[PDB]
Amino acid sequence: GITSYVRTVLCEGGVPQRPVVFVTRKKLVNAIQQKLSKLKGEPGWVTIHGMAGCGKSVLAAEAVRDHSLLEGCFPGGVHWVSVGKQDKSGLLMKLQNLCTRLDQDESFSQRLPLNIEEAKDRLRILMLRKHPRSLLILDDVWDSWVLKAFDSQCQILLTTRDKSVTDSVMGPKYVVPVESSLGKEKGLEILSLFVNMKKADLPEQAHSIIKECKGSPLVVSLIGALLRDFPNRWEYYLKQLQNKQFKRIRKSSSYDYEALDEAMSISVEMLREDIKDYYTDLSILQKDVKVPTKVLCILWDMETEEVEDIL
Ligand X SMILES: Nc1ncnc2c1ncn2[C@@H]1O[C@H](COP(=O)(O)OP(=O)(O)OP(=O)(O)O)[C@@H](O)[C@H]1O
Residue ranges for the known binding site are: 50-57, 161
Which of 97, 152, 153, 164 touches another protein (CB under 8 A)?
164
Residue 224 contacts ligand X per CB under 6 A = no
Comparing CB distances to ligand X, the nearer of 23 and 296 is: 23
Looking at 85-93, 98-106, 158-166, 301-309, which segment touches another protein (CB under 8 A)? 158-166
Nearer to ligand X, 155 or 221 (CB): 221
Cβ at position 51, least distance to ligand X in Å? 6
48 strand-pairing partners: 159
* Piece of the chain touching another protein by CB under 8 A; list 77-85, 157-165, 174-182, 207-215: 157-165
CB atoms within 10 A of CB 237: 18
Using CB under 6 A, pick the residue from 15, 48, 58, 176 that binds ligand X: 58
Among 105, 106, 179, 229, binds another protein (CB under 8 A): 229
Other C-beta atoms within 10 Å of 241: how many?
20
**Which position among 44, 50, 171, 215 is part of the footprint of ligand X (CB under 6 A)?**
50
Between the alpha carbon of residue 305 and those of residues 20, 63, 220, the distances in Å are 48, 39, 42
Cβ atoms 72, 41 nearer than 8 A: yes
Asked if 194 interacts with ligand X (CB under 6 A), we say no
Which residues make up each annotated binding site for ATP? 50-57, 161
SS3 135: strand
CB of 232 to another protein, least distance (A): 8
Q: Tell me the Cα Rg of the chain.
A: 23
Q: Are 224 and 187 in contact (CB under 8 A)?
A: no
Angle in degrees, 0-180, between the axes of helices 204-213 and 217-229, rounded to the nearest 10: 150
**Judged by CB under 8 A, which of 87, 162, 256, 281 binds another protein?**
162
DSSP at 202: S
Q: How many CB atoms lie within 10 A of CB 199?
A: 16
DSSP string, 92-121: HHHHHHHHHHT-TT--S-S---SSHHHHHH
Binding string to another protein for residues 10 to 49, with x set by CB under 8 A, is what?
---------------------------------------x
Dihedral (C-alpha) 18, 20, 21, 27: value to the nearest 10 degrees? 20
The nearest distance, CB 67 to ligand X, in angstroms, is 21
Q: Whole-number minimum distance, CB 133 to ligand X, in Å?
A: 26
Residues recorded for the chain: 311
Amino acid at residue number 295: V
If contact means CB under 5 to 8 A according to the sort of partner, which of another protein, its own copies, ligand X, none does residue 273 touch? none
Is the Cβ–Cβ distance between 104 and 70 less than 8 Å? no
149 binds ligand X (CB under 6 A): no
Q: What residues make contact with ligand X under the rule CB under 6 A?
A: 19, 21-23, 25, 50, 52-58, 190, 217-218, 221, 256
Q: What residues make contact with another protein under the rule CB under 8 A?
A: 49, 161-162, 164, 167, 229, 231
